């Protein structure tokens, strides 16, 4: 995806559907970041209980 953004970043300003795909993938990435943060928090809780 990052290589796509590097090569074809100019065609986003023209094509509307690619903008919609980028925004949808943005929302999915934010959801996965939240899940990863939640997992790191539960890992810290597990460390407190195990230790």
């Amino acid at each position: 995806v990052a290589v796509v953004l590097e090569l074809y970043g100019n065609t986003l300003e023209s094509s509307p559907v690619l903008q919609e795909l980028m925004i949808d993938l943005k929302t999915k990435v934010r959801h996965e970041i939240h899940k990863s943060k939640e997992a790191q928090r539960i890992e810290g809780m597990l460390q407190l209980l195990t230790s």
């Binding site: 810290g44 460390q47 407190l48 230790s51």
Partner: protein, 237 residues
């Protein structure tokens, strides 16, 4: 494993002459003792260097350290003590009370913190959790986190009292990597039961704003890592 250590069967320099010369040197004569000892070892550098392997015999170190403490128990310590603190084969037994004797002199105290091997975790954590806060706190934190296992640091924080733990917590809350790892160890040490609600809420808000600023800084990091038909134009002829 059982038989380990239990066996019943039992540029050269004159170390004995160096000890004799240092003993013949008068007490409280820091310059004379340093001159004699550095002339005996014959290396220019005040700190330890890779050159002088031969001085690393232990009995020389024990005799010299005892003579230093006897001669300058009340007087100012020479640069010989600085050299021995930079020396890696420092005796293990002296470190039990080394920091207490050198607490008065800040330069030698800092040198012992940053260079002297085998500073015990007891006195290290006691000095760190002391309320002095003399800005050597970062060096002590780096030393303990680098040289001691996380389990042993947590075990010693279990022994340490709750009030000094509290005082360290509001000190951090008022106001970094070593500090955050230390705070994590302190939280693991105090465990489930004992932490007050008000201090806990202030710590929660502090950690939340640090998470916000950390995510912001990672964003900045990755930002730095990142024919029309009719055209009307002028012509110059």
């Amino acid at each position: 494993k059982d038989s380990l250590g239990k066996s019943f069967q039992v540029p050269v320099l004159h170390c004995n002459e160096v000890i004799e010369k240092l003993s013949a040197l008068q007490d409280n004569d820091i310059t004379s003792f340093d001159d004699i000892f550095f002339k005996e070892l014959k290396i220019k550098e005040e700190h330890y260097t890779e050159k002088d392997r031969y001085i690393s015999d232990p009995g020389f170190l024990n005799k010299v350290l005892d003579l230093i403490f006897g001669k300058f128990s009340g007087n100012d310590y020479p640069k010989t003590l600085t050299f021995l603190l930079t020396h890696p084969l420092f005796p293990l037994s002296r470190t039990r009370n080394l920091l207490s004797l050198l607490r008065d002199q800040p330069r030698l105290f800092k040198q012992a913190i940053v260079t002297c091997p085998n500073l015990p975790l007891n006195e290290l954590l006691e000095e760190l959790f002391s309320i002095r806060n003399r800005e050597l706190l970062l060096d002590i934190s780096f030393r303990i986190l680098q040289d001691f296992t996380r389990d042993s640091i947590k075990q010693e924080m279990k022994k340490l009292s709750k009030l000094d733990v509290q005082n360290f917590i509001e000190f951090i809350t008022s106001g970094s990597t070593q500090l955050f790892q230390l705070l994590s160890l302190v939280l693991d040490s105090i465990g489930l039961f004992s932490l007050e609600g008000a201090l806990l809420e202030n710590l929660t808000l502090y950690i939340d704003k640090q998470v916000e600023i950390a995510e912001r800084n990672t964003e900045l990091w990755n930002l730095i890592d990142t024919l029309p038909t009719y055209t009307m134009e002028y012509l110059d002829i």
